[PDB]
Design an enzyme around this catalytic site. Structure first.
Site, PDB file in Angstrom:
ATOM      1  N   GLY E  29      -8.487  -0.023  12.435  1.00  0.00           N
ATOM      2  CA  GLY E  29      -8.882   1.162  11.671  1.00  0.00           C
ATOM      3  C   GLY E  29     -10.348   1.194  11.278  1.00  0.00           C
ATOM      4  N   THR E  30     -10.758   2.291  10.642  1.00  0.00           N
ATOM      5  CA  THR E  30     -12.152   2.482  10.227  1.00  0.00           C
ATOM      6  C   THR E  30     -12.485   1.606   9.023  1.00  0.00           C
ATOM      7  OG1 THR E  30     -11.732   4.351   8.709  1.00  0.00           O
ATOM      8  CG2 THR E  30     -12.134   4.888  11.031  1.00  0.00           C
ATOM      9  N   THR E  31     -13.777   1.425   8.768  1.00  0.00           N
ATOM     10  CA  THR E  31     -14.233   0.553   7.691  1.00  0.00           C
ATOM     11  C   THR E  31     -14.091   1.240   6.330  1.00  0.00           C
ATOM     12  OG1 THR E  31     -15.892  -0.320   9.248  1.00  0.00           O
ATOM     13  CG2 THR E  31     -16.077  -1.011   6.941  1.00  0.00           C
ATOM     14  N   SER E  74      -7.574   1.213   5.124  1.00  0.00           N
ATOM     15  CA  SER E  74      -7.901   1.194   6.547  1.00  0.00           C
ATOM     16  C   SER E  74      -6.658   0.842   7.351  1.00  0.00           C
ATOM     17  CB  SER E  74      -8.989   0.158   6.823  1.00  0.00           C
ATOM     18  OG  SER E  74     -10.182   0.477   6.133  1.00  0.00           O
TER      19      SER E  74
END
Ligand SMILES: [Cl-]
Ligand SMILES: [Mg+2]
Lengths: 204, 240, 235, 231, 243, 244, 111, 250, 241
Positions: E29-31, E74
């Protein structure tokens, strides 16, 4: 209206010397109307005797119920139930209907097969045990039976004397009660013989 | 509760549990049904591997569902009791709510519906039983004979057999039973039913059971001697 | 083993696709919709000559204005028919009117995907639901175990479906009469059936606005079969 | 492979294959396009037929006077989810006398779809939805995936060959967003967008399906000769 | 083998491989990050712009619980939303009975127990998110981070997602260079920088910055989103540092 | 989920057999042989205890022969623990019938039902069946003396003489040979013990390896008496018949 | 003891013409001898060219109208925007009312 | 969640074996040796206190447990399974008997109830069998003294004397030679200590051995006076000192 | 081989899931120790904060179950907190129902019974933790009772848990072999903590700073944990003799 006095009836039990006696009237009614003169209120499960007064449907129902429970007791325990134990079973079974009770006045009578000790007991409709040495009374003429038993009874009576005492207690109490009578039966119980006598009384 | 889907489709579009239930029926003893002009006869095989049996008390193969309807079966014996009990309860329930006894078609439809329900309910397996249901509708003189099977399909038959070696006795019935002129009397109907079982049974002694059902709740089961007389007459004519 | 409601890598429910294979093994059923009515016809397919063919009920009444033909595991259809009949009559109770054919079909299709680990598996039967209402007129629907339903001018389901559908592709037009449709169902049934078509191993039915849903007698169908033979021999 | 038997199982790389297979059902489905301006929001759907005798499967469903969606994939799953939206839109009206916000409608769909991806026995939804609506904060377009992911967009497309229409909208972004107070021109841009996803077949009268909602425009669906204007 | 096919099964190591596979979804996932400051906390997240068609500032990722707690995560976004919905129920029942708003450590355990419960049975799947959350209560500021296993600790700074290593390194520098502490407005600026620096791991697609904060002085101990001029000021500070 | 570990106890084999029922029967075939023989004036129940020990308290022991009511008894072959579950259900049963109709339960009705309970475990619930086979010996005023058997399939049948457990094939052949319809209880007692003595896997048949019972109208006038034989009484009947 | 019912007064009147219909009602809302509102609408446009008024206990009247309007909405969804005829609406309302046979809507209704 | 294991985990194999019961019996075999001997005027049950660590206080862990005033129990196999069975056995003695009949159950019926619980774990959904064999010694008025064994299957047998666990085969042989029908309780205790010494490796004293008896009534252990019929519990656990006294005359 | 996935018997009569739960116990790589004084019970545990970003005050494996009972856990923190919450609930319910504070050994038994259920019932997994309960009981005095995933529990004179438990166990064994008593003969709890730390240092062979340790102390009517500064004072006293 009062369920304990619709059908009418009486039961009385007495102790003697190495013996017990239990007796009942034979009447079943619908208030003023006499319906049956053959409604016996005493039952036995092996050598333990149970007399039940009160509402006749509950009398019949409880008999069938204790027959059920004592037959299973015997199959598992491989022996007949004793009076002291049966008394606890009756108390248990009545209190489990604490807030919807059977309208009955049971009386237990019997002799312990091992100790040989005579035993009687009475209950209220929800299981409170009255373990008495002398006598137990139940029914619509309970007040009358208390007066007769308390005055006629004496301890350590022989079977053939005890018969006369319990019979006279029952008969004269029944004759002062409109809802009791129409015949009477007396069981004389000893350690290994039981006699059953039908009494002659007025049929009104 | 146990919810597992036991009856499910396979890649080739088959429900194997329902098909394996038919194999249990194939193993079961032979049962045959033949309807005449004014009667229906139900014949049943009793395998003679079991001797020292008490024939008085042994569960009979033909069961009365009501006074006017009977049910025989092939397959698992224990399973059949559950269907019969349900059918008997429904028969009384129908009388109790509609004030008429069930028609043979209705009773069959109910039993078939129960069998079907067990092919798409979780946690249960299909009944390993096929039934022959026969009788006469109330105030009717037309004979009725139906068949059911584990899948839940049902249909009416002029004559039909189920169970082990049913292929052989069906072959016999297909060439011997004439639709234009069916067994006119009870004798002719019973004779044809016994003949058909004699193709498969082995011995004609205590291996054949026969039950005749006539109109207006007239149901009777034949005895060993009565059946033995049919067995005697058939083979004596055959010696020619 | 594996879940009953499992998706395949291609994005299809295994059990729904497998039920469709069971429907292909079923006996042929054909429906043709016209402006004079909708005709429904089926192959009975008796397994034996001793089986009384008139007891084979593969065409069924749902309401006076809605009929239904089935193909596949026909035992599975009984609860669907029961639901449909209850839905049709219940709507008449609540709204004092006939129920739309589409709404009835939608009600049946809502049962389809109610399976999991509710019933244990999808239905193994396809239905041709034909009927008439005041809004959309004469209609023919094809209800699958996927929960999907398509409306059709003409449709064939069962073992001879793709062969029959290709024939219905060429033969159907918007000006078909009821009599022409009757003969057309008989023609195509006779083509795809294994055994020779007659009044005992095939059944016709129709739904009209006036007379409602009617299953044809064997005597009436026999005449339509005889009328078919003569018109094919005419050229 | 070994980790695709049910929805309750992660793969060694952290993937949920049953959800990915449900996503695959959307790609097999027919193309549908969504786009909006500041005043209106438009759905355009290419309907699919079984054959020439069959009807064209309906793609657009109305949820309320101010909201509706188009589907792509398993139609029955869209019926379940659209019914849920109808109930939620209706709960908001009856209890709070309040039209349901489109953003909140997306949050509810996300949460409903998610429960099916974490529990044993059930399955993910096999359908993608494009929700359009007009609420107190203007026009809106949402994209729903059965993984649970919901995304607010200016325009988008889902289904087979949907990449062509999505590229067109990505170029036209600055133009069609400015189409305010002109419903016909916004639909034209939608019909031109869905045309980029067509091969062999073209837009006919019973093939095309259009829906619109806006400032003084209730959610209405156009089918049949009503869309002949835009062909 | 076969120990990784079912949740809640111990391997011969004593590990729950299904939870470890859930971590892989988090790492994909994204930060997202969290920074604990003098009198509060700051949350920031990387939002990947997949397409120009995405409406800016609309697809909000950071979620509020009650009025004083912020949550960011995330991994699988729906799993995070499910977890926050539960958090809100937990916070509501706490306030209903005890009157006071739920303390952050109390709230942290409510989520922790719920996530941990999803590692006890094979009939459920572990959560595919690591959740950074916190806020201000009667005892001051608190920052927490919660893993798929149900494990959580208190943090001075926290980071998760694809750019977690880069972020963690930057957070460690702030802890060393500011022992006396960091202000709320500073933490917002630093948060923006760290997300921009962490974006090198997701450098293919361009991104959108989203920040929120709870501070006793700046927001009266309530959770608020960083908007308008203060957001642009943080973006400018972040853009200046990468160049 | 949990599906992975489900054995599926209630399914058909491709051949149309119930796996678990067949395997339960295989279990029962290793159990001690039990024999029932029905005569004109009574019924005999004989059964073999499995490899006992000298330190086993025999007089208070009961693994084979159980009492259901005053008129009906059963011989067990299989898992004793499973049998006791069913036995207590059957006892409650006979009492329910007695309470309802004020008459002792007919033998077949009691049998049909235990058999219906067994059947249920083969068709639904996902549980293993009861690994038990019963021989029911009973009396009622309709059919008189009756012998039945039930097995894990839930199927039951009536018998004149029958065996369950180990070596039933050999035992049934011996019974079929020497049994006659006009037979009496004293003769049936002898047949039962002789059959066990020849089919036993033990070196010799002794009193400590046997349970024995009779149901006789040999009670004072028109009534029925159950006699569960004591160890000393089994020892005497073994000497009387000439086995030891 | 809590009395769940009340009387909000008012009177309504419906007259049917040859090609038209009217539904009238006063706008006064009351309890006992007090006036609550001099203008509180009691007759509503429910959709599909149907007008409705539930007179008696206002809380039950508002609930019934609200439910019928909702019934019309779902009739469109479920039956392809079909127009609900007046006779079909009447039958539907019977079932709304009888669903509370043992705790009634204290209103006289006219459509 | 929900317990979705509604199906049996113990099933018949093709050979007719119930695998989980067999495996449970194997777990009992690995367990520490325990034994029971019945005398004319009492019963004795004994076992080794296998201490897991010398830092552990082995007094706190009770392998021999009171079920009723006149019934005691000891086990071989898995200790935790035994502990919960004792909790259930104590409770069922009250709920299914004492609260009905106003007296404690006889040994055989309590054993029957314990056996029922263990059988159900062999057939019910989503559970394994108990991994223990119990030896239950007790006394009641009409049956006298008795000793029962209860296995994982739920089967129970009455014994004059027996042993279960690690060295049961050797211990049962030892008991066969020594046992007779005229043994007094002290003679049975002596034999129990002799039999148990053979299976013990390390220290053999009152602190490493756990031993209890069912014998005469103990009015000193009743806790109250005034009711003649109540004469006290027949179950008594021997102290460390009482064991050591009998080890000198060994 | 599904007998290794759920809690059913293997052919050897073993429960592999229970055995693997024991292995999860050492996943944290932390060693704990518990000893008894005259008036007190002391429990110490290693504290390891590897990440600089962690708030070290929140990193703890010692729990205050009730006012009188303390618990240290050896195993992963999620299971540890699961057990802690349950024990707190049980201790509170006990007091409400029975009118007195739950004893340490009774709580240990209750938690051990819960653990036993997970070894028997298939749908529930064992917790991969070892729970060491400590208190000064009003009837039994200083008390240490330890529970494990098998459902086993027992009282202790002293005990140790973790990867290097054997080294600590033998060290304690040797001390009690000399003194010939079941406890640390010392008046103040401060000196009992000093004993506990000293003997862990000797057994493990490592020196400790104030942030390397975590200490819990049980006295009559209260259990409490020591702060870093309280531990520092303890470490100073050890070094000065
Ligand atoms: Cl407990
Ligand atoms: Mg008179």
């Amino acid at each position: 209206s009062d369920p304990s006095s619709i059908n009418g009836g009486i039961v009385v039990a007495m102790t003697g010397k190495d013996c017990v006696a239990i007796a009942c009237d034979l009447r079943l009614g619908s208030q003023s109307l006499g319906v049956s003169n053959k409604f016996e209120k005493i039952f036995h499960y092996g050598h333990v005797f149970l007399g039940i007064t009160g509402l006749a449907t509950d009398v019949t129902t409880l008999n069938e119920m204790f027959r059920y429970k004592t037959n299973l007791y015997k199959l598992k325990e491989e022996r007949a139930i004793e009076p002291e134990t049966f008394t606890q079973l009756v108390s248990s079974s009545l209190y489990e209907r604490r807030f919807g009770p059977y309208f009955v006045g049971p009386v237990v009578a019997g002799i312990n097969s091992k100790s040989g000790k005579p035993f009687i007991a009475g209950f209220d409709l929800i299981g409170c045990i009255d373990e008495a040495k002398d006598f137990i009374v139940s029914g619509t003429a309970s007040d009358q039976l208390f007066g007769m038993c308390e005055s006629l009874y004496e301890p350590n009576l022989e079977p053939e004397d005890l018969f006369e005492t319990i019979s006279q207690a029952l008969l004269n109490a029944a004759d002062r009660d409109a809802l009791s009578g129409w015949g009477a039966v007396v069981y004389i119980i000893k350690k290994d013989e039981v006699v059953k006598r039908y009494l002659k009384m007025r049929q009104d | 509760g146990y919810d597992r889907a036991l009856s499910i489709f396979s890649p080739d579009g088959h429900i194997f549990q329902v098909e394996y239930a038919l194999e249990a029926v194939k193993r079961g003893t032979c049962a045959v049904g033949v309807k005449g002009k004014n009667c229906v006869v139900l014949g049943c095989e009793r395998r003679s591997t079991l001797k020292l049996q008490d024939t008085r008390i042994t569960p009979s193969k033909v069961s009365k569902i009501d006074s006017h309807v009977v049910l025989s079966f092939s397959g698992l014996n224990a399973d059949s009791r559950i269907l019969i009990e349900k059918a008997r309860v429904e028969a009384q329930s129908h009388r109790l709510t509609l004030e008429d006894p069930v028609t043979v078609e209705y009773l069959t439809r109910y039993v078939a519906g129960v069998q079907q329900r067990y092919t798409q309910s979780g946690g249960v397996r299909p009944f390993g039983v096929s039934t022959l249901i026969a009788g006469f509708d109330p105030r009717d003189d037309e004979p009725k004979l139906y068949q059911t099977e584990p899948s839940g399909i049902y249909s009416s038959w002029s004559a039909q057999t189920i169970g082990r070696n049913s292929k052989t006795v069906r072959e016999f019935l297909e060439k011997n039973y004439d639709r234009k002129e069916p067994p006119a009397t009870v004798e002719e109907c019973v004779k044809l039913t016994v003949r058909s079982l004699l193709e498969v049974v082995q011995t004609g002694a205590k291996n054949i059971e026969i039950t005749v059902v006539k109109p207006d709740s007239d149901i009777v089961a034949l005895s060993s001697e009565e059946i033995n007389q049919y067995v005697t007459q058939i083979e004596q004519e055959k010696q020619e | 083993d594996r879940g009953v409601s499992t998706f395949s890598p291609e994005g299809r429910l295994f059990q729904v696709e497998y039920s469709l294979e069971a429907i292909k093994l079923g006996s042929t059923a054909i429906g043709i919709a016209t402006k004079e009515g909708v005709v429904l016809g089926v192959e009975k397919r008796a397994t034996s000559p001793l089986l009384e063919s008139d007891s084979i009920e593969k065409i069924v009444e749902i309401d006076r204005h809605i009929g239904c033909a089935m193909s596949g595991l026909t035992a599975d259809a009984r609860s669907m028919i029961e639901h449909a009949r209850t839905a049709a009559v219940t709507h008449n109770l609540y709204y004092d009117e006939d129920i739309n054919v589409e709404s009835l079909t939608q009600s049946v299709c809502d049962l389809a995907l109610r399976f999991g680990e509710l019933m244990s598996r999808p239905f193994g039967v396809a239905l041709l639901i034909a009927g008439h209402d005041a809004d959309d007129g004469y209609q023919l629907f094809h209800a699958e175990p996927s929960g999907t339903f398509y409306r059709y001018n003409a449709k064939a389901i069962g073992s001879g479906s793709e062969g029959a559908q290709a024939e219905l592709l060429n033969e159907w037009h918007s000006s078909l009469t009821l009599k022409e449709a009757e003969l057309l169902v008989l023609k195509i049934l006779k083509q795809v059936m294994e055994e020779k078509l007659d009044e005992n191993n095939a059944q016709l039915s129709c739904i009209t606005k006036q007379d409602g849903f009617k299953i044809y007698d064997n005597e009436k169908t026999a005449e339509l079969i005889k009328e078919l033979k003569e018109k094919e021999a005419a050229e | 492979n070994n980790y695709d038997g049910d929805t309750v199982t992660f793969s060694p790389t952290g993937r949920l294959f049953q959800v990915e297979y449900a996503l695959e059902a959307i790609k097999q489905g027919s193309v549908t396009v969504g786009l909006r301006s500041n005043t209106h929001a438009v759905l355009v759907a290419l309907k699919r037929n079984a054959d020439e005798l069959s009807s064209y499967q309906k793609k657009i469903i109305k949820c309320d006077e101010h909201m509706g969606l188009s589907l792509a994939g398993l139609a029955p799953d869209a019926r379940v989810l659209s019914n849920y939206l109808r109930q939620q839109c209706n709960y908001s009206s009856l209890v709070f006398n309040r039209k349901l916000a489109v953003e909140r409608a997306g949050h509810l769909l996300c949460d409903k779809a998610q429960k099916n991806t974490q529990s044993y026995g059930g399955r993910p939804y096999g359908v993608g939805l494009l929700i359009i609506g007009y609420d107190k904060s203007g026009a809106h377009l949402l994209e729903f995936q059965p993984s649970g992911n919901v995304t607010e967009l200016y325009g988008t497309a889902i289904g087979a060959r949907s990449q062509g229409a999505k590229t067109y909208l990505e170029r036209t972004l600055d133009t069609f967003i400015k189409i305010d107070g002109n419903p016909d021109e916004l639909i034209k841009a939608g019909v031109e967008a869905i045309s980029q996803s067509l091969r062999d077949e073209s837009l006919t009268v019973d093939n095309l399906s259009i829906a619109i909602v806006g400032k003084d425009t209730p959610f209405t669906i156009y089918d049949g000769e009503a869309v002949a204007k835009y062909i | 083998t076969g120990y990784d096919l079912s949740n809640s099964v111990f391997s011969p190591d004593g590990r729950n491989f299904q939870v470890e596979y859930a971590v892989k979804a988090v790492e994909n996932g994204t930060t997202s990050i969290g920074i604990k400051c003098n009198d509060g906390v700051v949350f920031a997240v990387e939002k990947l712009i997949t397409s120009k068609l995405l409406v800016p500032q609309k697809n909000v990722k950071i979620q509020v619980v009650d009025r004083h707690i912020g949550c960011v995560y995330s991994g699988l976004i729906p799993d995070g939303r499910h977890l926050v919905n539960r958090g809100r129920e937990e916070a509501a029942s706490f306030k209903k009975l005890y009157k006071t708003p739920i303390p952050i450590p109390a709230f942290a355990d409510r989520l922790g127990q719920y996530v941990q419960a999803h590692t006890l049975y094979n009939s459920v799947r572990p959560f595919g998110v690591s959740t950074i959350f916190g806020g201000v209560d009667k005892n001051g500021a608190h920052l927490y981070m919660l893993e798929p296993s149900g494990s959580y600790w208190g943090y001075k700074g926290a980071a998760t997602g694809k750019g977690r290593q880069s972020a963690k390194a930057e957070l460690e520098k702030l802890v060393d260079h500011h022992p006396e502490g960091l202000s709320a407005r500073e933490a917002v600026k630093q948060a923006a920088k760290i997300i921009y620096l962490a974006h090198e791991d997701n450098k293919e697609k361009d991104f959108e910055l989203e920040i929120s904060w709870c501070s006793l002085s700046e927001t009266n101990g309530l959770h608020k989103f960083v908007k308008g001029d203060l957001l642009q000021e943080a973006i400018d500070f972040a853009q200046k540092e990468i160049n | 989920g949990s599906r992975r570990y489900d054995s599926r106890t209630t399914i058909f084999s491709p051949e149309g057999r119930l796996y678990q029922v067949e395997y339960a029967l295989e279990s029962i075939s290793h159990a001690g042989t039990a024999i029932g023989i029905m005569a004109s004036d009574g019924i005999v129940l004989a059964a073999e205890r499995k490899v006992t020990s000298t330190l086993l308290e025999q007089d208070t022991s009961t693994e084979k022969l159980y009492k259901l009511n005053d008129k009906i008894a059963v011989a067990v072959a299989g898992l004793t623990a499973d049998a006791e579950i069913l036995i207590n259900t059957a006892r409650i049963h006979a009492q329910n019938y007695l309470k309802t109709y004020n008459e002792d339960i007919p033998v077949e009705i009691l049998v049909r039902r235990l058999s219906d309970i067994k059947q249920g475990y083969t068709q639904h619930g996902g549980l293993r069946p009861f690994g038990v086979s019963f021989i029911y010996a009973g009396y009622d005023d309709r059919y008189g003396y009756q012998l039945y058997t039930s097995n894990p399939s839930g199927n039951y049948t009536g018998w004149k003489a029958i065996s369950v457990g180990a070596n039933t094939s050999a035992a049934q052949t011996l019974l079929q040979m020497d049994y006659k319809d006009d037979m009496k209880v004293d003769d049936a007692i002898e047949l039962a013990l002789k059959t066990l003595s020849k089919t036993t896997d033990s070196s010799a048949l002794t009193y400590d390896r046997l349970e024995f019972a009779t149901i006789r109208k040999g009670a004072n006038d028109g009534e029925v008496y159950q006699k569960i034989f004591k160890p000393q009484e089994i020892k005497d009947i073994l000497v009387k018949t000439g086995i030891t | 003891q809590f009395n769940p019912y009340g009387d909000n007064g008012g009177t309504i009147l419906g007259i049917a013409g040859e090609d038209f219909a009217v539904l009238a009602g006063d706008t006064r809302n009351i309890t006992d001898y007090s006036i609550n509102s001099r203008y509180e609408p009691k007759v509503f446009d429910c959709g599909d060219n149907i007008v409705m008024s539930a007179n008696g206990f206002a809380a039950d009247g508002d609930a019934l109208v609200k439910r019928f309007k909702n019934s019309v909405k779902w009739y469109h969804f479920d039956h392809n925007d079909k127009k609900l005829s007046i006779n079909s609406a009447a039958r539907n309302i019977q079932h709304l009312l009888y669903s509370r046979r043992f705790f009634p809507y204290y209103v006289y209704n006219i459509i | 969640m929900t317990d979705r294991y509604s199906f049996s985990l113990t099933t018949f194999s093709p050979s007719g074996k119930l695998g989980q019961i067999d495996y449970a019996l194997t777990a009992v075999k690995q367990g520490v040796t325990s034994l029971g001997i019945k005398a004319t005027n009492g019963v004795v049950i004994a076992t080794e206190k296998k201490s897991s660590s010398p830092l552990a206080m082995s007094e706190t862990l009770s392998k021999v447990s009171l079920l009723t005033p006149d019934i005691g129990a000891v086990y071989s196999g898995m200790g935790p399974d035994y502990r919960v069975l004792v909790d259930k056995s104590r409770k069922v003695a009250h709920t299914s008997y004492k609260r009905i009949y106003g007296e404690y159950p006889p040994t055989k019926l309590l054993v029957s109830e314990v056996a029922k619980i263990m059988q159900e774990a062999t057939q019910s959904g989503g559970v394994r069998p108990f991994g223990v064999s119990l030896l239950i010694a007790g006394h009641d008025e009409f049956n006298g003294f008795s000793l029962y064994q209860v296995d994982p299957s739920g089967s129970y047998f009455p014994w004059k004397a027996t042993a279960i666990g690690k060295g049961s085969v050797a211990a049962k042989t030892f008991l066969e030679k020594r046992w007779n029908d005229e043994l007094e309780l002290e003679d049975a205790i002596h034999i129990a200590l002799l039999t148990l010494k053979e299976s013990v490796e390390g220290e053999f004293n009152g602190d490493t051995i756990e031993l209890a008896i069912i014998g005469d009534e103990n009015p000193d252990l009743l806790g109250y006076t005034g009711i003649p019929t109540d004469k006290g519990p027949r179950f008594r656990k021997l102290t460390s000192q009482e064991i050591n006294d009998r080890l000198e005359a060994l | 081989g599904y007998d290794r996935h759920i809690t059913i018997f293997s052919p050897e009569g073993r429960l592999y899931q229970v055995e693997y739960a024991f292995k999860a116990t050492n996943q944290t790589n932390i060693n704990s120790l518990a000893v008894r004084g005259k008036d007190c019970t002391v429990v110490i545990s290693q504290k390891k904060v590897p990440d600089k970003l962690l708030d070290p005050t929140t990193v703890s494996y010692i729990f205050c179950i009730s006012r009188t009972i303390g618990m240290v856990v050896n195993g992963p923190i999620p299971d540890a907190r699961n057990a802690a919450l349950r024990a707190k609930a049980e201790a509170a319910e006990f007091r409400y129902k029975y009118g007195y504070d739950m004893p340490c050994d009774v709580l240990a038994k209750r938690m051990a019974n819960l653990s036993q259920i997970y070894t028997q019932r298939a749908y529930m997994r064992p917790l991969g933790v070892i729970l060491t309960f400590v208190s000064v009981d009003e009837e039994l005095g200083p008390s240490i009772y330890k529970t494990d995933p098998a459902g086993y529990y027992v009282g202790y004179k002293a005990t140790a848990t973790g990867p290097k438990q054997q080294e600590i166990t033998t060290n304690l064994e040797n001390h009690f072999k000399k003194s010939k008593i079941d406890h640390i003969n010392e008046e103040s709890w401060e000196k009992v903590v000093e004993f506990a730390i000293t003997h862990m240092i000797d057994a493990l062979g490592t020196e400790f700073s104030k942030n390397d340790l975590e200490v819990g102390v049980a006295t009559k009517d209260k259990f409490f944990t020591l702060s870093a500064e309280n531990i520092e004072e303890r470490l100073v006293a050890i070094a000065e003799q």
